[PDB]
Write a protein that binds this ligand. Sequence first.
Ligand SMILES: *[C]C(*)(*)(*)(*)([C]*)C(*)(*)(*)(C(*)(*)(*)(=O(*)*)N(*)(*)(*)C(*)(*)(*)(*)([C](*)[C@]1(*)=C(*)(*)(*)C(*)=[C@](*)(*)C(*)(*)(*)(*)(*)(*)=C1(*)(*)*)C(*)(*)(O*)C(*)(*)(*)C(*)(*)(*)([C](*)C1(*)(*)(*)=C(*)(*)(*)(*)(*)(*)C(*)=C(*)[C@@](*)(*)=C1*)C1(*)(*)(*)=N(*)(*)(*)C(*)=C(*)(*)(C(*)(*)(*)(=O(*)*)C(*)(*)(*)(*)([C])[C]*)[N@]1(*)*)N(*)(*)(*)(*)C(*)(*)(O[C]C1=[C][C]=[C][C]=[C]1)=O*
Lengths: 99, 99
Amino acid sequence: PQITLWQRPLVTIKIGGQLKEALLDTGADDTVLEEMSLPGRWKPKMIGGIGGFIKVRQYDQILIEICGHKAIGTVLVGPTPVNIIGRNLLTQIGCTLNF
Amino acid sequence: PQITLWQRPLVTIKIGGQLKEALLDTGADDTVLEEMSLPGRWKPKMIGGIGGFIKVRQYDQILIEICGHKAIGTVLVGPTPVNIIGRNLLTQIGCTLNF
Ligand SMILES: *[C]C(*)(*)(*)(*)([C]*)C(*)(*)(*)(C(*)(*)(*)(=O(*)*)N(*)(*)(*)C(*)(*)(*)(*)([C](*)[C@]1(*)=C(*)(*)(*)C(*)=[C@](*)(*)C(*)(*)(*)(*)(*)(*)=C1(*)(*)*)C(*)(*)(O*)C(*)(*)(*)C(*)(*)(*)([C](*)C1(*)(*)(*)=C(*)(*)(*)(*)(*)(*)C(*)=C(*)[C@@](*)(*)=C1*)C1(*)(*)(*)=N(*)(*)(*)C(*)=C(*)(*)(C(*)(*)(*)(=O(*)*)C(*)(*)(*)(*)([C])[C]*)[N@]1(*)*)N(*)(*)(*)(*)C(*)(*)(O[C]C1=[C][C]=[C][C]=[C]1)=O*
């Protein structure tokens, strides 16, 4: 799909048996989702953005269905205001930026 | 151009007689540039990112060359880690995400 940007690029994701809308974020190296029940081990990892650093739950080889497109990756879980789909998943769904 | 996301979407911009590399960002509503040598009146404005909140100075009516494509708008200057190009300027240069 061709998504224009007059509105925040929000898409629907299905993760861990649940539904959440997420922002397609070309400015995020990583995918970070707001706190949710997700299964198995993880690792502490801190990530940085505007405003500062937050501590996150590092999850890998997690299946996410992005706008009904499946993929598997590192998903970080934590104190983020918006669910963010970062470039580590954007290239999986073959998403490009165009102008 | 058409940018695939396997690496950060950095692009060259020219603002206020100077040259910088900035990141095209679909998750940024606004454009926030590092502390720079930019002139006019500006108003305090504050923003939220994943780590929290910075105070920035807002300049409106600013001209920017993003890939030889000049656009005009609001530019927020302050303590950002990288130069960010938000959706307020991205829509102006015809930017769309595709997948
Ligand atoms: C993975 C994520 C933590 C990412 C990040 O925060 N990215 C920012 C832009 C950025 C900031 C600092 C450095 C580099 C890029 C942005 O994409 C995130 C959004 C998240 C968001 C979206 C919607 C609502 C609320 C939050 C964002 N932050 C601020 C906005 C705004 O719209 C403001 C203008 C109101 N939107 N970090 C990352 O790597 C960090 C890094 C690593 C190595 C060197 C330098 C930086 O990609």
